[PDB]
Symmetry: C2
Subunit: 143 residues, 2 copies
Protein backbone atom coordinates (compact mmCIF):
# COMPACT_ATOMS: atom_id res chain seq x y z
CA UNK A 1 0.00 0.00 0.00
CA UNK A 2 2.60 2.53 -1.18
CA UNK A 3 2.11 5.33 -3.69
CA UNK A 4 4.86 6.75 -5.88
CA UNK A 5 5.75 10.28 -4.79
CA UNK A 6 8.03 11.45 -7.63
CA UNK A 7 9.38 10.47 -11.05
CA UNK A 8 12.81 11.43 -12.39
CA UNK A 9 14.30 10.58 -15.79
CA UNK A 10 17.82 9.20 -15.40
CA UNK A 11 18.69 8.86 -19.08
CA UNK A 12 19.83 5.70 -20.80
CA UNK A 13 21.35 3.07 -18.52
CA UNK A 14 22.03 -0.65 -18.73
CA UNK A 15 19.04 -2.67 -17.59
CA UNK A 16 18.37 -6.31 -16.83
CA UNK A 17 15.55 -8.76 -16.39
CA UNK A 18 15.08 -12.34 -15.24
CA UNK A 19 12.67 -15.07 -16.27
CA UNK A 20 10.74 -17.55 -14.12
CA UNK A 21 8.64 -20.57 -15.03
CA UNK A 22 5.56 -20.21 -12.77
CA UNK A 23 3.75 -16.90 -12.11
CA UNK A 24 5.51 -14.11 -13.93
CA UNK A 25 6.41 -11.95 -10.97
CA UNK A 26 9.07 -11.67 -8.29
CA UNK A 27 9.65 -9.61 -5.15
CA UNK A 28 12.11 -6.72 -4.88
CA UNK A 29 13.58 -5.20 -1.75
CA UNK A 30 10.77 -4.08 0.55
CA UNK A 31 8.29 -6.48 -0.98
CA UNK A 32 7.23 -4.77 -4.20
CA UNK A 33 6.17 -7.19 -6.92
CA UNK A 34 7.81 -6.79 -10.35
CA UNK A 35 6.57 -8.40 -13.53
CA UNK A 36 8.68 -11.09 -15.20
CA UNK A 37 6.58 -11.27 -18.33
CA UNK A 38 8.36 -11.55 -21.66
CA UNK A 39 8.08 -7.85 -22.41
CA UNK A 40 10.25 -5.07 -23.82
CA UNK A 41 11.73 -2.62 -22.85
CA UNK A 42 10.60 -3.77 -19.41
CA UNK A 43 13.76 -4.16 -17.38
CA UNK A 44 15.42 -2.93 -14.19
CA UNK A 45 18.51 -0.93 -13.33
CA UNK A 46 21.62 -2.84 -12.22
CA UNK A 47 21.23 -1.91 -8.55
CA UNK A 48 17.61 -3.03 -8.19
CA UNK A 49 17.68 -5.58 -5.39
CA UNK A 50 15.82 -8.89 -5.72
CA UNK A 51 15.07 -10.92 -2.60
CA UNK A 52 16.62 -14.37 -2.97
CA UNK A 53 16.18 -17.33 -0.65
CA UNK A 54 19.84 -18.31 -0.79
CA UNK A 55 21.61 -14.95 -0.58
CA UNK A 56 19.10 -12.40 0.62
CA UNK A 57 18.97 -9.17 -1.35
CA UNK A 58 21.12 -9.13 -4.49
CA UNK A 59 21.30 -6.56 -7.30
CA UNK A 60 19.64 -7.86 -10.44
CA UNK A 61 22.65 -6.72 -12.49
CA UNK A 62 24.87 -9.01 -10.45
CA UNK A 63 22.38 -11.88 -10.66
CA UNK A 64 22.31 -11.48 -14.45
CA UNK A 65 25.98 -10.71 -15.13
CA UNK A 66 27.14 -13.72 -13.12
CA UNK A 67 24.08 -15.83 -14.02
CA UNK A 68 23.47 -16.55 -10.34
CA UNK A 69 21.31 -19.60 -9.73
CA UNK A 70 18.86 -18.51 -7.09
CA UNK A 71 15.27 -18.65 -5.88
CA UNK A 72 12.90 -15.68 -5.78
CA UNK A 73 9.58 -14.95 -4.07
CA UNK A 74 6.40 -14.76 -6.14
CA UNK A 75 2.68 -14.23 -5.62
CA UNK A 76 0.04 -16.57 -7.03
CA UNK A 77 -3.37 -15.51 -8.32
CA UNK A 78 -4.90 -15.97 -4.85
CA UNK A 79 -2.27 -13.78 -3.19
CA UNK A 80 -0.23 -16.57 -1.61
CA UNK A 81 3.56 -16.21 -1.46
CA UNK A 82 5.80 -18.98 -2.79
CA UNK A 83 9.35 -19.44 -4.06
CA UNK A 84 10.59 -20.47 -7.49
CA UNK A 85 13.98 -20.58 -9.22
CA UNK A 86 15.31 -18.06 -11.69
CA UNK A 87 15.17 -19.66 -15.14
CA UNK A 88 16.48 -16.91 -17.46
CA UNK A 89 19.02 -14.07 -17.15
CA UNK A 90 19.08 -11.19 -19.63
CA UNK A 91 21.28 -8.16 -20.10
CA UNK A 92 18.95 -5.91 -22.08
CA UNK A 93 21.50 -3.25 -22.95
CA UNK A 94 20.97 0.47 -22.59
CA UNK A 95 17.36 1.62 -22.19
CA UNK A 96 15.64 4.75 -20.95
CA UNK A 97 15.41 4.52 -17.15
CA UNK A 98 13.16 6.45 -14.76
CA UNK A 99 13.69 6.72 -11.03
CA UNK A 100 10.49 6.43 -9.02
CA UNK A 101 10.72 7.48 -5.38
CA UNK A 102 7.97 5.93 -3.27
CA UNK A 103 6.16 7.40 -0.27
CA UNK A 104 7.93 4.85 1.96
CA UNK A 105 11.32 6.13 0.77
CA UNK A 106 11.87 3.16 -1.56
CA UNK A 107 13.43 3.76 -4.97
CA UNK A 108 12.64 1.83 -8.14
CA UNK A 109 14.73 2.50 -11.25
CA UNK A 110 13.07 0.86 -14.22
CA UNK A 111 12.03 1.38 -17.78
CA UNK A 112 8.79 3.27 -17.44
CA UNK A 113 6.72 0.50 -19.03
CA UNK A 114 7.82 -2.00 -16.37
CA UNK A 115 4.75 -3.63 -14.92
CA UNK A 116 4.38 -3.83 -11.15
CA UNK A 117 1.56 -5.18 -9.02
CA UNK A 118 -0.92 -2.70 -7.55
CA UNK A 119 -2.85 -3.35 -4.34
CA UNK A 120 -5.77 -4.87 -6.27
CA UNK A 121 -3.51 -7.64 -7.56
CA UNK A 122 -3.32 -6.32 -11.12
CA UNK A 123 -0.16 -5.60 -13.16
CA UNK A 124 0.23 -2.06 -14.50
CA UNK A 125 3.14 -0.07 -15.99
CA UNK A 126 4.97 1.78 -13.23
CA UNK A 127 4.54 5.06 -15.08
CA UNK A 128 0.77 4.60 -15.02
CA UNK A 129 0.88 3.70 -11.34
CA UNK A 130 2.69 7.01 -10.80
CA UNK A 131 0.43 9.15 -12.99
CA UNK A 132 -2.82 7.72 -11.66
CA UNK A 133 -1.56 7.86 -8.05
CA UNK A 134 -2.18 4.16 -7.43
CA UNK A 135 -0.86 2.08 -4.55
CA UNK A 136 1.76 -0.55 -5.20
CA UNK A 137 1.37 -3.94 -3.58
CA UNK A 138 3.95 -4.38 -0.82
CA UNK A 139 4.37 -7.86 0.66
CA UNK A 140 5.58 -7.35 4.25
CA UNK A 141 5.70 -11.12 4.97
CA UNK A 142 9.10 -11.92 3.39
CA UNK A 143 12.31 -12.95 5.28
CA UNK B 1 6.87 -28.71 -35.73
CA UNK B 2 6.03 -26.08 -38.36
CA UNK B 3 8.36 -23.47 -39.84
CA UNK B 4 7.25 -20.11 -41.18
CA UNK B 5 7.60 -19.98 -44.96
CA UNK B 6 6.98 -16.28 -45.71
CA UNK B 7 6.45 -12.90 -44.07
CA UNK B 8 4.31 -10.10 -45.50
CA UNK B 9 3.70 -6.64 -44.03
CA UNK B 10 -0.01 -5.82 -44.00
CA UNK B 11 0.22 -2.26 -42.69
CA UNK B 12 -1.54 -0.91 -39.65
CA UNK B 13 -4.62 -2.85 -38.55
CA UNK B 14 -6.67 -3.15 -35.38
CA UNK B 15 -5.27 -5.81 -33.07
CA UNK B 16 -6.42 -7.50 -29.90
CA UNK B 17 -5.13 -9.55 -27.01
CA UNK B 18 -6.55 -11.50 -24.08
CA UNK B 19 -5.28 -12.12 -20.58
CA UNK B 20 -5.29 -15.33 -18.53
CA UNK B 21 -4.45 -16.01 -14.90
CA UNK B 22 -2.34 -19.21 -15.06
CA UNK B 23 0.37 -19.86 -17.68
CA UNK B 24 0.56 -16.95 -20.07
CA UNK B 25 -0.22 -18.77 -23.28
CA UNK B 26 -3.21 -20.00 -25.26
CA UNK B 27 -3.82 -22.13 -28.34
CA UNK B 28 -4.82 -20.77 -31.75
CA UNK B 29 -6.41 -22.63 -34.62
CA UNK B 30 -4.23 -25.61 -35.56
CA UNK B 31 -2.62 -25.76 -32.15
CA UNK B 32 -0.04 -22.98 -32.24
CA UNK B 33 0.71 -21.49 -28.83
CA UNK B 34 0.51 -17.70 -28.51
CA UNK B 35 1.88 -15.70 -25.60
CA UNK B 36 -0.55 -13.91 -23.27
CA UNK B 37 2.14 -12.02 -21.39
CA UNK B 38 1.51 -8.39 -20.55
CA UNK B 39 3.50 -7.08 -23.49
CA UNK B 40 3.19 -4.37 -26.13
CA UNK B 41 2.63 -4.12 -29.09
CA UNK B 42 2.09 -7.88 -28.91
CA UNK B 43 -1.41 -8.46 -30.22
CA UNK B 44 -3.30 -10.37 -32.92
CA UNK B 45 -5.39 -9.45 -35.93
CA UNK B 46 -9.18 -9.55 -35.55
CA UNK B 47 -9.58 -12.78 -37.52
CA UNK B 48 -7.04 -14.81 -35.56
CA UNK B 49 -8.99 -17.80 -34.27
CA UNK B 50 -8.65 -18.95 -30.65
CA UNK B 51 -9.79 -22.44 -29.71
CA UNK B 52 -12.42 -22.18 -26.97
CA UNK B 53 -13.96 -25.03 -25.01
CA UNK B 54 -17.46 -23.60 -25.20
CA UNK B 55 -17.68 -22.38 -28.80
CA UNK B 56 -14.83 -23.95 -30.71
CA UNK B 57 -12.80 -21.60 -32.87
CA UNK B 58 -13.67 -17.91 -32.47
CA UNK B 59 -11.92 -14.82 -33.84
CA UNK B 60 -10.08 -12.97 -31.10
CA UNK B 61 -11.58 -9.68 -32.32
CA UNK B 62 -15.05 -11.05 -31.67
CA UNK B 63 -14.02 -12.47 -28.28
CA UNK B 64 -12.65 -9.05 -27.32
CA UNK B 65 -15.28 -6.78 -28.88
CA UNK B 66 -18.13 -8.71 -27.24
CA UNK B 67 -16.09 -9.60 -24.13
CA UNK B 68 -16.97 -13.26 -24.58
CA UNK B 69 -16.56 -15.31 -21.42
CA UNK B 70 -14.80 -18.45 -22.56
CA UNK B 71 -12.13 -21.03 -21.76
CA UNK B 72 -8.91 -21.48 -23.72
CA UNK B 73 -6.27 -24.22 -23.94
CA UNK B 74 -2.83 -23.64 -22.44
CA UNK B 75 0.43 -25.52 -21.97
CA UNK B 76 2.17 -25.83 -18.60
CA UNK B 77 5.93 -25.87 -18.06
CA UNK B 78 6.00 -29.67 -18.38
CA UNK B 79 4.14 -29.62 -21.70
CA UNK B 80 0.75 -30.76 -20.39
CA UNK B 81 -2.40 -29.26 -21.90
CA UNK B 82 -5.06 -27.73 -19.66
CA UNK B 83 -7.92 -25.23 -19.89
CA UNK B 84 -8.37 -21.88 -18.17
CA UNK B 85 -10.81 -18.98 -18.50
CA UNK B 86 -10.17 -15.73 -20.29
CA UNK B 87 -9.65 -13.04 -17.65
CA UNK B 88 -8.96 -9.88 -19.69
CA UNK B 89 -10.06 -8.53 -23.08
CA UNK B 90 -8.18 -5.71 -24.81
CA UNK B 91 -8.69 -3.78 -28.01
CA UNK B 92 -5.16 -2.51 -28.61
CA UNK B 93 -5.99 -0.15 -31.46
CA UNK B 94 -4.12 0.07 -34.72
CA UNK B 95 -0.67 -1.53 -34.80
CA UNK B 96 1.72 -2.70 -37.48
CA UNK B 97 0.68 -6.21 -38.51
CA UNK B 98 2.67 -8.86 -40.37
CA UNK B 99 1.20 -11.91 -42.06
CA UNK B 100 3.23 -15.07 -41.51
CA UNK B 101 2.36 -18.00 -43.78
CA UNK B 102 3.45 -21.31 -42.29
CA UNK B 103 4.69 -24.42 -44.09
CA UNK B 104 1.44 -26.20 -43.12
CA UNK B 105 -0.58 -23.49 -44.87
CA UNK B 106 -1.57 -21.80 -41.60
CA UNK B 107 -1.63 -18.01 -41.43
CA UNK B 108 -0.78 -15.91 -38.39
CA UNK B 109 -1.36 -12.15 -38.54
CA UNK B 110 0.30 -10.53 -35.56
CA UNK B 111 2.48 -7.68 -34.48
CA UNK B 112 5.94 -8.93 -35.30
CA UNK B 113 7.06 -8.93 -31.66
CA UNK B 114 4.28 -11.35 -30.69
CA UNK B 115 5.82 -14.24 -28.81
CA UNK B 116 4.91 -17.78 -29.81
CA UNK B 117 6.14 -21.11 -28.49
CA UNK B 118 8.85 -22.92 -30.46
CA UNK B 119 9.26 -26.70 -30.39
CA UNK B 120 11.74 -26.50 -27.50
CA UNK B 121 9.04 -24.99 -25.28
CA UNK B 122 10.50 -21.48 -25.28
CA UNK B 123 8.70 -18.23 -26.17
CA UNK B 124 10.22 -16.15 -28.98
CA UNK B 125 8.99 -13.23 -31.12
CA UNK B 126 7.33 -14.54 -34.26
CA UNK B 127 9.62 -12.41 -36.41
CA UNK B 128 12.65 -14.11 -34.88
CA UNK B 129 11.07 -17.51 -35.39
CA UNK B 130 10.71 -16.57 -39.06
CA UNK B 131 14.19 -15.12 -39.52
CA UNK B 132 16.00 -17.92 -37.72
CA UNK B 133 13.88 -20.59 -39.47
CA UNK B 134 12.71 -22.15 -36.21
CA UNK B 135 9.84 -24.59 -35.76
CA UNK B 136 6.71 -23.47 -33.99
CA UNK B 137 5.16 -25.76 -31.42
CA UNK B 138 1.93 -27.25 -32.76
CA UNK B 139 -0.31 -29.11 -30.30
CA UNK B 140 -2.23 -31.69 -32.35
CA UNK B 141 -4.10 -33.05 -29.29
CA UNK B 142 -6.87 -30.42 -29.07
CA UNK B 143 -10.63 -30.99 -29.77
CA1 LIG C 1 12.08 -7.54 -20.58
CA1 LIG D 1 -0.38 -7.00 -25.60
CO1 LIG E 1 3.84 -13.30 -18.68
Amino acid sequence: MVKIATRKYLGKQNVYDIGVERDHNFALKNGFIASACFAHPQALSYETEILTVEYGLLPIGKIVEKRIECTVYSVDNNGNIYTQPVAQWHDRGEQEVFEYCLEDGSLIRATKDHKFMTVDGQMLPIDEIFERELDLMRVDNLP
